[PDB]
């Protein structure tokens, strides 16, 4: 089908969301003012998926911006494409959430959630046939994690037949030395297992490791990390925005990629890796299955692919991709499950990103993602066993039993992943 409504919530959600819109606007010939300056009609066929058409032939992003911290509003406005979002679509509270999931989910964030829903309804009713939602956020803070999961749940209550898709940035001690973030992410994962159809797991442990160890950036910044994110989000949404041959939408993605309802957490991957200032088809198909090119800090060779999608971008032989994908699928045979036949899908798109002649984007549903959940589970449990700072949460009305249940659900998820790794 067609239209997607995008919500970005909290600091990380808004910072990576803003870069997403700068990146695809340049790909679609949209300028900071909104006017179309492209030289190819292929940029306009499916522009309706992400942009509404305004009077005077100007395209406004189907984008909703929410935070409990008003300071985020001014920052997005002060960006280059900051004067393109609908001012009516800015929804900002008074006091933030102070990295407190419970303030996002139960108190401060709950008070604002009706106002966000009003603009979601307005943006939804003006869609010909809305296919679903996307949400950008971090799991480690208070607003994106706490208020984001609340907003997801109320949306899924009111739009139970539409697809809910998230880009969810997982915390790393290497990037944020804030010890309550295992709490916030675990409590959110509990909700995400139940209330999203498909979740892209973007891991700041991966992004930092990529910049530092591979890109030689001695001191990575959020700008450096989000350059990686922006390339990934552009890649995974390529089929949604250009014609190609995959009549692309989010629900077909879910049907083909998610064999079991809870195992809907994707490991993305990108090639080539590049910095913010600085290839053959066989080199791409090899990098795409390399652990160092994943955006989730785990080893695909420690598990088994259930389902995989690739998107090649640029000018290349359809046969050369088909042949190389065949090759990679033969040498790595013991890393694909054998009870889902034909479980690797290739897409090709003529239009490459900016500054690249050819790129590849990987989307994998792999049992190896349990290593990310195991990592967060260990850190959650270390803090939880000493009950460190638990009163910051219970003081907002949370019951302590909500921690053990989130912890039990995450260990159940790691187990479910292991079962289908073992299966034959």
């Amino acid at each position: 089908m067609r239209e997607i409504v995008h919500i970005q919530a909290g600091q990380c959600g808004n910072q990576i969301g803003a870069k997403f819109w700068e990146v695809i606007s340049d790909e679609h010939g949209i300028d900071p003012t909104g006017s179309y300056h492209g030289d190819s009609d292929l940029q306009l066929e499916r522009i309706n998926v992400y942009y509404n058409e305004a009077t005077g032939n100007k395209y406004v992003p189907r984008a909703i911006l929410v935070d409990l911290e008003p300071g985020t509003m001014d920052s997005v406005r002060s960006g280059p494409f900051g004067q393109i979002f609908r001012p009516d679509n800015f929804v900002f509270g008074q006091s933030g959430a102070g990295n407190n999931w419970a303030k996002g989910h139960y108190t401060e964030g709950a008070e604002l959630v009706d106002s966000v829903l009003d603009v979601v309804r307005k943006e939804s009713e003006s869609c010909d046939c809305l296919q679903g939602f996307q949400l950008t956020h971090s799991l480690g803070g208070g607003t994106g994690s706490g208020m984001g999961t609340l907003l997801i749940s109320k949306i899924r209550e009111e739009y139970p037949d539409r697809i809910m898709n998230t880009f969810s940035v997982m915390p790393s001690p290497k990037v944020s030395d804030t010890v309550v973030e295992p709490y916030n992410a675990t409590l959110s994962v509990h909700q995400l297992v139940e209330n999203t159809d498909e979740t892209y797991c973007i891991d700041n442990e991966a992004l930092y490791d990529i910049c530092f160890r591979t890109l030689k950036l001695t001191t990575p910044t959020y700008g450096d990390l989000n350059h990686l994110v922006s390339a990934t989000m552009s890649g995974v949404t390529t089929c949604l925005r250009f014609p190609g041959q995959l009549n692309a939408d989010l629900r077909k993605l879910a049907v083909n990629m998610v064999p079991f309802p809870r195992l809907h957490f994707f490991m993305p991957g990108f090639a080539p890796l590049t910095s913010r200032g600085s290839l053959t088809v066989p080199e791409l198909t090899q990098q795409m299955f390399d652990s160092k090119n994943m955006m989730a800090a785990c080893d695909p060779r420690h598990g088994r692919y259930l389902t995989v999608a690739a998107i090649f971008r640029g000018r290349m032989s359809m046969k050369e991709v088909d042949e190389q994908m065949l090759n990679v699928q033969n040498k790595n045979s013991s890393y694909f499950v054998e009870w889902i036949p034909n479980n690797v899908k290739t897409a090709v798109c003529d239009i490459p990103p900016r500054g690249l002649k050819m790129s590849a984007t990987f989307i994998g549903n792999s049992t190896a993602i349990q290593e990310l959940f195991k990592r967060i589970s260990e850190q959650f449990t270390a803090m939880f066993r000493r009950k460190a700072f638990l009163h910051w949460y219970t003081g907002e009305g949370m019951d302590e039993m909500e921690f053990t249940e989130a912890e039990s659900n995450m260990n159940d998820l790691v187990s479910e992943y292991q079962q289908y790794q073992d299966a034959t």
């Binding site: 001690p173 290497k174 010890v179 490791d209 160890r213 785990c298 195991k374 270390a382 066993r385």
Partner: protein
């Protein structure tokens, strides 16, 4: 009973109140219902100056709560580097073991406070120390693929 007030003052970083209570006979080694001392809470919540005044007034730097946690355990878990160093300078047992078999080194590694890991190694933390699951600090770094930690632990 001034012990309950010292406990709250130490948690909330109220330096003035801590001094006043100690001068009026407050039990520096009072415990809450779980066995935490004022030193436990000052180390937990990062109040360096309160840690230092408590240690000049008879705090047991190696007190344990009912779970076996020392102040050094909690400082290493939460990541309060300057307090870790003060605790070691005043006699903390670098290899104290809690009821999960965790040492401070285990906790600092798990939480990724790499500066604290280096500090503890340089004071004799036991790299062979196993938790109740058999895991050493090095085991954690391998099962998590934390290459920075594993490098640190090889010195």
């Amino acid at each position: 009973d001034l012990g309950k007030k010292l406990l709250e003052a130490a948690r909330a970083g109220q330096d003035d109140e801590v001094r006043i209570l100690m001068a009026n006979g407050a039990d520096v080694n009072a415990t809450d219902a779980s066995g935490l001392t004022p030193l436990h809470l000052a180390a937990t919540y990062g109040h360096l100056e309160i840690v230092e005044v408590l240690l000049k007034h008879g705090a047991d730097v190696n007190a344990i709560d009912i779970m076996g946690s020392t102040p050094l355990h909690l400082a290493a878990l939460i990541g309060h580097l300057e307090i870790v160093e003060v605790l070691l300078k005043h006699g903390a047992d670098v290899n104290a073991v809690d009821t999960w078999g965790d040492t401070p080194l285990h906790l600092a590694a798990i939480m990724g406070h790499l500066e604290i890991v280096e500090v503890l190694l340089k004071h004799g933390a036991d790299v062979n120390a196993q938790d109740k699951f058999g895991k050493t600090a090095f085991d954690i770094s391998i099962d998590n693929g934390n290459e920075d930690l594993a490098e640190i632990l090889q010195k």
